[PDB]
Amino acid sequence: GSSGSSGPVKVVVGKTFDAIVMDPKKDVLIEFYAPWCGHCKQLEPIYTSLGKKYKGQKDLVIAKMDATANDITNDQYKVEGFPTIYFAPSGDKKNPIKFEGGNRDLEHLSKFIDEHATKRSRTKEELSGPSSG
């Protein structure tokens, strides 16, 4: 349990990344934002609600980190363009899930979490997409 001082979205660092973002106790959604990017600005608010709202979920904590400052020791997590969201499922983290839909909003983002979520609601994963990556 961690309260939000200046926002609902939990902030993680390199020293608390492999501990939080890589917490096998619960699925943590890490979103690499850039303090020098515009897209992140329009998403700033979009993500805020996405967290404060998902705060009432099961073993789920929508956090974020500044890949620009913190170096992602991992290798599976790559930040080519911001914003960049990654869902780390408690257990199968080794395989990160980048939000790939087209429209980054509070309506689409939620549709990506509920699916890749900890199987909370009645929903399956039937996608005939690529494997590698």
Curated annotation (Swiss-Prot):
Q: Where is the Thioredoxin domain?
A: 8-118
Can you tell which superkingdom this protein's organism belongs to?
Answer: Eukaryota
Q: How does this polypeptide assemble, per the annotation? A: Part of a large chaperone multiprotein complex comprising DNAJB11, HSP90B1, HSPA5, HYOU, PDIA2, PDIA4, PDIA6, PPIB, SDF2L1, UGGT1 and very small amounts of ERP29, but not, or at very low levels, CALR nor CANX. Component of a complex containing at least CRELD2, MANF, MATN3 and PDIA4.
Organism, as annotated: Mus musculus (Mouse)
> What is the protein's given name?
Protein disulfide-isomerase A4
The disulfides recorded in the entry are 37-40
Where can this protein be found? Endoplasmic reticulum lumen; Melanosome
Q: Where is this motif: CXXC?
A: 37-40
Family statement drawn from the similarity comment of this UniProt entry? Belongs to the protein disulfide isomerase family.
Span of the annotated motif Prevents secretion from ER? 124-127
